[PDB]
């Protein structure tokens, strides 16, 4: 496993280390969207930070299941439940949860 750069912000080449993590906060609502990205490993660009992504870059064809592990780095006092959905090919970005 290697870091999946889901946060993409080149601004300003100094805050580059922010690219390695999600912002998650106390939403004062219901089921707000947190983040979203493509599952395509060889495609640009979040998978391009992973070792799998670059090694995939040396191969035109791949096959098999993939695993994306999410680690929460809040305080121990912080709790929360979140849904994480994989939508197979076809269908657009899920407008709501």
């Amino acid at each position: 496993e290697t870091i999946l750069e889901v946060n993409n912000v080149p601004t300003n080449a100094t805050s580059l280390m922010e690219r390695l993590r999600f912002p998650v906060s106390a939403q004062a609502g219901k089921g707000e969207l947190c983040a979203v990205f493509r599952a395509d490993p060889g495609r640009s660009g979040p998978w391009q930070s992973t070792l799998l992504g670059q090694l995939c870059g040396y191969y035109t064809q791949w096959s098999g299941s993939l695993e994306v592990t999410f680690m929460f780095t809040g305080s121990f006092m912080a709790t929360g439940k979140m849904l994480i959905a994989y939508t197979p090919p076809g269908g657009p970005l899920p407008k709501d949860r």
Binding site: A26, K30, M77, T79, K81
Partner: protein, 246 residues
């Protein structure tokens, strides 16, 4: 091995939890398909399995410091949702049990306790004109609220003359904020018939209601949501026709 850490995988859905109570098996009886001796319809039913037998997230209420509690009527909650509801519309007969996973989490400095309960044949009554001299009946939006659910008129009386003071008879599970953060109820198909309409009749009702009020100091989180999740088990449909709704 532990009792509070659980995982529920059905179809392509998966629910994890680390702060739970043990799973309740309804009436000490696991959901099952209909035998050839209980059934009466001669049609060969469809048992779509994975496509319809999976978790559905249908609502999320905000537990405020002064809330009366809500309810949902099954299986009217899914009738417009997913490929389960599609089968429930094109067909006349339906049969399934559910795996309800009510969930609500807060800090360790929050307090309060919910009461998750599955009350079969939850018939709803009306305030009889305030005085008792009016045989009024509830609208469709009250007996079959569906997705968003309905807020109780009065919680003490369960809007039916029956007391919530003894609701823990039928399969229940508390969500006490200082111990658990989710409840899980597995019910079988509870009916006197092997199959039913699924549109007209509602097998049971989920009653999510707080008894000990939510409370918290001037902390950094006042928005505490309760989320309802359910999953049909051993689903059967028979009597195929055109698509019919409410």
């Amino acid at each position: 091995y532990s009792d509070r850490v659980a995982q529920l995988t059905i179809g392509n859905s998966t629910i994890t939890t680390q702060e739970a109570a043990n799973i309740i098996v309804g009436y000490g009886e696991w959901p099952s398909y209909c035998s050839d001796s209980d059934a009466t319809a001669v049609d060969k039913p469809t048992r779509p399995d994975v496509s319809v037998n999976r978790f559905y997230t249908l609502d999320t209420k905000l537990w405020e410091k002064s809330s009366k509690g809500w309810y949902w009527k099954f299986p009217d909650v899914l009738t417009e949702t997913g490929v389960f509801g599609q089968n429930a519309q094109f067909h006349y007969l339906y049969r399934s049990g559910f795996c309800i996973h009510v969930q609500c989490n807060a800090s360790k400095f929050h307090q309060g306790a919910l009461l998750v309960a599955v009350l079969p044949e939850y018939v709803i009554g009306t305030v009889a004109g305030g005085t008792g001299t009016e045989d009024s009946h509830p609208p469709y939006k009250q007996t079959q609220p569906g997705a968003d659910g309905f807020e109780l008129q009065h919680p003490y009386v369960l809007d039916a003359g029956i007391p919530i003071s003894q609701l823990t008879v039928c399969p229940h599970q508390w969500i006490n904020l200082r111990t658990n953060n989710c409840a899980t109820i597995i019910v079988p198909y509870i009916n006197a018939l092997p199959f039913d309409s699924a549109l007209n009749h509602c097998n049971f009702g989920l009653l999510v209601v707080p008894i000990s009020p939510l409370d918290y100091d001037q902390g950094a989180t006042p928005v505490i949501p309760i989320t309802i999740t359910l999953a049909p088990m051993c689903s059967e449909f028979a009597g195929l026709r055109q698509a019919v709704t409410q």
